[PDB]
């Protein structure tokens, strides 16, 4: 048993190196398909996966030759635990292959969607990224908005109903083979905490009132713009008017809903263009930010192998921005169809946060080369993006000119941040509440579409621009739903990124609550080695410890908390509550009529 724990350590040392290498090969094939969708690359990705799944199955089986639960070392027990978790790889060989073909079908459908120009039904090569997204973010013609919404959702959503259904059945069977109740519990296992769901319910209910105030004010402002025929006072907001295809963030309509329209509203897109920014510049600036904090510089493989602009050769590819770890040394990459905008600048930093995490933990053993939990991975880049979005940072890099930071410009910037950060929370909760409710069997197949729009109404108070029914199937019109990417990570990120940002700001000397000149919402952590250090301590851990331990490394705390995100927005809350009362703004909404059962 002592003898045995010593051999086990050697077994792990060696098997970890082998999984890195086999995964490397699967990652390269996935990369090739995602950057160039073809039948041939599909076949290749899916065959290499099939093979890696088969080997994982043998590894799981050989775990039972070791008395690992009897061992002394927490660390060895943790690695063995992690090797027992097969996920889809637990499926019979044939079911696994079917599942991969189902996943390919959906993701490739999403990526190849094209629609006809509203103004020209002969031009039929408009893609979400960038053509349809540009209209949704910029047009204030409600009818054009509605048209693109229907065209998109009909092709990206409804077209893959039968595929989505088989995926739920196979996902459910895979979870049961791992002895989880459903896919919901399989995802939740990543957070290592039996009360996790409850914890988020608690946090969500504490911020909901702020969301409802924001919702109410936006609805008021949209009525003055579009008039009462297009937006009602008491009903859900028509989602097509909120500047995003899924209404997940509303910051693209800030110019019509901002508190003080005569005071400055930060939008540096136009200046980025005026100064000749490219994608390459944007990523080099993101690099600069990380190295400024004494973190690790992008390696050369990054620059040689990343794809940072949409190919011009008319190939099909997944443009949904992503970051990739190849599981060797220093081979990390981003695939981003980058455009020169303010919000793409933030995305660049978002993505490079994943890359940094990968570089920070690449000396760990294979099974620890992932986030402390999924939410940690998503948060890293957003802590930087927070800084980058500040007027402070933006004047430093010359993108924001002639800005005066009076009380009214502060409220504008606060609100603008809230349109991305508070608004998102209900949206993000719903993506997984929906999927969970299907995975767990709580909704009947006859009710699957209206169950989606029900959640969206109940939690976000938004609805489709047109009537939908069980003849439509709208959920897979969101990337992550079509691609089988758990979404809760993003809700977790949006809470915990404030815990990290506040703590990083304190460490940098950029925030003191008792000093009016260092308010949280204008903290820049650029150049702070103090913040950098705290990051290094947490990120270098990988998944070597449960996530509270990784948090504790960063700032000493162990609990996921809503206190920070509220502390950030508290000045907005005060003002906004008062402004809604001042203007007699109706808060809340009636039940949507847009989904017919
Ligand atoms: C998900 O949960 C599943 C249960 O719902 C679970 O499946 C069970 O896993 C067991 C593996 O631990 C497996 O156990 C073996 O059962 C054999 C009996 O088989 C049939 O008879 C049953 C009873 O009447 C029927 O109901 C079943 O359908 C079966 O088909 C036994 O032969 C076998 O035994 C040997 O194995 C143990 C090994 O155990 C340990 O090893 C060390 C030594 O190496 C021991 O010292 C240690 O203390 C411990 O015992 C030996 O003790 C023994 O001498 C033999 O070598 C074994 O018990 C069980 O059949 C299976 N049941 C069911 C209902 O499926 C899945 O494993 C779970 N999945 C995941 C992913 O976790
Ligand atoms: C895309 O993949 C195919 C294989 O199906 C290959 O022959 C083709 O030339 C690739 N395109 C690019 C631009 O890499
Ligand atoms: C930066 O990190 C190094 C290790 O890479 C460390 O020894 C040093 O203290 C840090 N430097 C700064 C600027 O704090
Ligand atoms: Zn991300």
Numbering used by the authors: 18 to 614
What does the report in the manuscript say about this coordinate set?
Angiotensin-I-converting enzyme (ACE, EC 3.4.15.1) is a promiscuous zinc metallopeptidase with a number of substrates, including the vasoregulatory peptides angiotensin I and bradykinin, the anti-fibrotic agent N-acetyl-SDKP, the neurotransmitter substance P, and amyloid-β peptide. Here, we present the use of the Drosophila melanogaster ACE homologue, AnCE (which, in particular, shares enzymatic properties with cACE), as a model to study the structural basis of ACE inhibition. The active site is located at the centre of this channel, marked by the location of the catalytic zinc ion, which is coordinated by His367, His371, and Glu395. The high-resolution crystal structures of AnCE in complex with the dipeptides VW, IW, YW, RW, and WR presented here reveal dual binding in both the non-prime (dipeptide-1) and prime (dipeptide-2) subsites of AnCE.
The YW-1 tyrosine forms a H-bond with Tyr496, which is not possible in IW and VW; however, it maintains the hydrophobic contact with Trp341 observed with those dipeptides. In YW-2, the tyrosine side chain forms hydrophobic contacts with Ala338 and Thr364 and a H-bond with Thr364. Interestingly, YW-2 folds in a conformation that allows for a π-stacking interaction between the tyrosine and tryptophan of the dipeptide. The additional difference map density around the tyrosine side chain in the S1′ subsite resulted in alternative conformations of the side chain to be tested, as well as dual conformations with the whole dipeptide flipped. The electron density remained ambiguous; for this reason, the dipeptide was left in a singular conformation. This ambiguity could be caused by lower affinity binding displayed by the dipeptide (Ki: 0.75 mM), which, in turn, could be caused by Thr364, though forming a H-bond, it could also have a repelling effect on the aromatic ring. The YW dipeptide shows low affinity for AnCE, with a Ki value of 750 µM (0.75 mM). The less clear electron density for YW bound to AnCE could be the result of low affinity binding causing the dipeptide to have low occupancy, or it could also be an indication of the tyrosine not being completely stabilised in one conformation, potentially due to the repelling effect that Thr364 could have on the aromatic ring of the tyrosine. This effect would also be present in nACE but not in cACE, which has a valine instead. The substitution to Phe512 in cACE could influence the binding of YW-1, as this would remove the possibility of the H-bond within this region, and instead be replaced with potential hydrophobic interactions.
